């Protein structure tokens, strides 16, 4: 009993360790999402190299 | 979705690039049109070389 109630803390201390990781990758998604708009804009040929290098 | 809404800006930035070009050739037409009257007038033989060179 004192093992399952303590192993329930370990299971919840692993839930926190995992929420932190996916919470962080939640933002790598948004950065990668914005990073993809600055390649559909850079692919247009109305841009100049002064503006592609600006992106 | 963020690609099609950005690729819709590229399509409209190409519409502007193309309107500028044909807007410019709109005047090369008028100059070429006037330039053709100063060859039906210069072809008449009541003109003298003092007036052909004047045209």
B3-to-A40, B11, B12, B13 alpha-carbon distances in Å:
7, 12, 14, 15
* Residue A48 sits at the chain B interface (C-beta within 8 Å): no
* Residue B29 sits at the chain A interface (C-beta within 8 Å): no
Tokens of B52: 């052909």
A17-to-A8, A10, A21, A43 alpha-carbon distances in Å:
14, 10, 7, 40
B16 contacts on A by Cβ (under 8 Å): 46
Q: Are A55 and A42 in contact (CB under 8 A)?
A: yes
Pick among B1, B4, B7 to test the A interface (most A CBs inside 10 A): B7
What is the rounded CA–CA span in Å between residue A39 and residue B3? 9
B12 contacts on A by Cβ (under 8 Å): none
- Residue that is written with structure tokens 């005047």 in the block: B27
């Amino acid at each position: 009993i004192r093992g399952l109630d303590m192993a329930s803390k370990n299971a919840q201390d692993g839930i926190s360790l995992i929420q932190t990781s996916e919470g962080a990758l939640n933002e790598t998604h948004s950065i990668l999402q914005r990073m993809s708009e600055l390649a559909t804009q850079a692919a247009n040929d109305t841009n100049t190299d002064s503006d592609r290098s600006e992106l």
